[PDB]
């Protein structure tokens, strides 16, 4: 029950293949709710979530305007960056911009973060006090200077602490049907013999939301326990996430292997044993 | 910077007009403001690229902007009125804030008839010798009288070269008949230089006045000389008096 | 929305303090000041939120109450003579859609070094029958009354600067179409 509103902007140059590609996506919690993409038929901010479907054209116009603004400035910003790093016009390069507000369980504002990256590396990073930057670089130090003068108006603090929070609280009330619904994982164990000496136990969590889960394996006995293979959480492609953990156990010993699952959709942690 | 075409426009009441703005290149936003005398600019409309976004609540549907190609923009006023007479300021920016720059403007005067328009008559007046002995200086005065409307640019020209040291043109004009609303205007200008510099026989003075009035487009059926855009000038030389 | 002074009166070499009045200013609205020289379009000079700011051009001071702020011009010059407008808002809702007041007309006058109120008569270079009157070298601390009868014509004052001889002076002009240049004031 620790909630977020976060935006992810990507800009990528294409020397003599048009002007730079620009893409924006917004997230409440682990649900994407909006896209903008300056190529695709309509160069407009669009809903990616059934609950955004009944905001009127006021909302979309503002967000479309905000996007073209960010796009067109990032086209400029790439040329600047190309300048400070002295890189040719033929090279493609990448500017990324990310920010979010985080609430606690109680709806108390917890943290703001905003951050820029050039060609993969950290470029310019907003500080704790939300009114001052750290630049990784000699070149970034130029951009540090320019972003302090203008953000003496505390534009980030204003957004992150206030506008970002207010709108989080708004998106939560609109989506609640789907978003504040805790979907506990459908959980089962699978057995995959290797030799007569050993099988693999695989503990599955399937079709759960939010995406914060813990899959741990433990063994009753004093015996050794081979390293668990945890696969990284992965989208079903329908809102929900999947995860699994796997051990190889000596054949015979499979009923001493208990798999615990922690998730907020679960009243209390479930424990799960293979049963053929 | 922002550039505006043309800097001066006269138009007969009831007729249309079309100013143009050419913003700082790479600026994706362009705004039109309207400024009357002793008043801050009022916002009229703006664009992101070629998309005309918000359009003022209080705006005549006579007023209407276009920015095809999302570069230059043209404001168009239809069936002009008295009140329309105002400075039309253009502005360009990079998104919501950065690089926010205003152009110098287009001054518009709407005249109830073209016949009310008169070019200026210009005279340079030499310094008083009373002044030259006492204060050890020589104040020239230039005088443009009988022009309508107030679209004049008055420079000084010492020996072929424009000057700004010593110069003082009036802030705005005064009216010859302060009552009747379409009065004809008059404006003064001083050039003070050293007594010895006016007493040089080889030193040439010249008070130029650029007028802005009718153009070949404007039909003229009257007796008197068509009151066209012209430069009207007046000179003095230094004398050892 | 915000009120300031319709006009303010200064002497050269001084420091000048215009104060905007924004009692109902929003919590995240900030204060941003423009400078419009005679004829040219308004120019950004300084913006401030709550911290005091200081550029080449000027300095902006904001008190806690945040109900009013005060742009402060250093060693004010003759050139620094403009309308000074005070905007209160945010790009974020504004859209770069600036809302200007009447602003504050700033006059800067020169401290009259040697007060010497004269009057002189000048001859039309080409036709010497016609002339104009010159009230000049007088103190800033005086109004130039308007014309009186039909065809007397009298201009407001007009400060001129002679750079390579460090001498600023005043000057005005009267003319008529009998009428002695000995009569104005």
């Amino acid at each position: 029950g620790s909630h977020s509103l976060k935006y992810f902007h990507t800009s990528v140059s294409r020397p003599g293949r048009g002007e730079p590609r620009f893409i924006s996506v917004g997230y409440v919690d682990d649900t994407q709710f909006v896209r903008f993409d300056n190529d695709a038929a309509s160069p407009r901010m669009v809903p990616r979530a059934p609950w955004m479907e009944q905001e009127g054209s006021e909302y979309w116009d503002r967000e479309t305007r905000s996007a073209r603004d960010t796009a067109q400035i990032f086209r400029v910003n790439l040329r600047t960056l190309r300048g400070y790093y002295n890189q040719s016009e033929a090279g493609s390069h990448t500017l990324q911009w990310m920010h979010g507000c985080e609430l606690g369980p109680d709806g108390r504002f917890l943290r703001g973060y905003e951050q820029f990256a050039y060609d993969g590396k950290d470029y310019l990073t907003l500080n704790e006090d939300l009114r001052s930057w750290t630049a990784v670089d000699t070149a970034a130090q130029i951009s540090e200077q320019k972003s302090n003068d203008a953000s003496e108006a505390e534009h980030q603090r204003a957004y992150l602490e206030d506008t970002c929070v207010e709108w989080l609280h708004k998106y939560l009330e609109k989506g609640k049907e789907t978003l504040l619904h805790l979907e506990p994982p459908k959980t089962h164990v699978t057995h995959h013999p290797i030799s007569d000496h050993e099988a693999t136990l695989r503990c599955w969590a399937l079709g759960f939301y939010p995406a914060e889960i813990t899959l741990t394996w433990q063994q009753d006995g004093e015996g050794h326990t081979q390293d668990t293979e945890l696969v990284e959480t992965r989208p079903a492609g329908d809102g929900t996430f999947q995860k699994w953990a796997a051990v190889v156990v000596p054949s015979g010993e499979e009923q001493r292997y208990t798999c615990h699952v922690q998730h907020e959709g679960l009243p209390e942690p479930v424990t799960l044993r293979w049963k053929p | 910077g922002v550039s505006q075409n043309p800097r001066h426009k006269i138009t007969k009441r009831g007729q249309n007009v079309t100013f143009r703005c050419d913003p700082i290149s790479e600026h994706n936003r362009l705004y039109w403001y309207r400024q009357t005398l002793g008043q801050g600019p009022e916002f009229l409309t703006y664009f992101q690229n070629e998309a005309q976004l918000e359009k003022s609540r209080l705006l005549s549907d006579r007023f209407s902007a276009e920015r095809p190609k999302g570069s230059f923009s043209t404001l168009e006023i239809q069936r002009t009125e008295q009140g329309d007479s105002a400075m039309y300021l253009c502005a360009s920016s990079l998104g919501r804030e950065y690089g926010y720059t205003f152009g110098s403007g287009t001054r518009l005067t709407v005249v109830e008839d073209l016949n009310k328009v008169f070019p200026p008559e210009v005279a340079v007046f030499e310094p008083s010798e009373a002044e030259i002995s006492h204060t050890q200086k020589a104040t020239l005065v230039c005088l443009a009288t009988g022009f309508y409307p107030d679209h004049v640019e008055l420079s000084w020209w010492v020996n072929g070269k424009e000057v700004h040291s010593g110069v003082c043109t009036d802030p705005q004009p005064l009216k010859e008949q302060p009552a009747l609303n379409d009065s004809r205007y008059a404006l003064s200008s001083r050039l003070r230089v050293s007594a010895t510099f006016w007493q040089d026989p080889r030193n040439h003075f010249r008070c130029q006045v650029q007028f802005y009035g009718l153009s070949e487009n404007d039909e003229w059926t009257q007796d008197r000389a068509k009151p066209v855009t012209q430069i009207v000038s007046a000179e003095a030389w230094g004398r050892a008096d | 929305k915000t009120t300031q002074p319709i006009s303010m009166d200064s002497y050269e070499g001084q420091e000048v303090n215009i104060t905007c009045s924004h009692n109902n200013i929003a919590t995240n609205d900030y204060i941003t000041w423009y400078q419009q020289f005679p004829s040219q379009g308004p120019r950004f000079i300084i913006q401030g939120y709550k911290t005091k700011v200081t550029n080449e051009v000027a300095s902006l001071f904001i008190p806690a109450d945040r109900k009013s702020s005060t742009l402060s011009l250093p060693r004010v010059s003759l050139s620094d003579t403009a309308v000074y407008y005070c905007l209160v808002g945010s790009s974020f809702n504004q859209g770069g859609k600036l809302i200007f007041g009447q602003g504050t007309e700033l006059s800067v006058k020169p401290n009259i070094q040697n007060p010497d109120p004269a009057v002189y008569q000048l001859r039309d270079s080409k036709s010497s029958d016609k002339s104009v009157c010159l009230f000049t070298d007088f103190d800033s601390q005086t109004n130039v009354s308007q014309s009186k009868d039909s065809d007397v014509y009298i201009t407001d004052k007009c400060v001129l600067d002679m750079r390579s001889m460090d001498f600023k002076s005043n000057s005005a002009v009267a003319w008529s179409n009998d009428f002695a240049c000995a009569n104005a004031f």
């Binding site: 924006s24 305007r65 905000s66 960010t70 600047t80 310019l124 709108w167 | 990079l94 998104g95 804030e97 | -």
Partner: peptide, 9 residues
């Protein structure tokens, strides 16, 4: 809602 930049780099 997102926010467009006010400065540049």
């Amino acid at each position: 809602r997102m926010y467009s930049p006010v400065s540049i780099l």
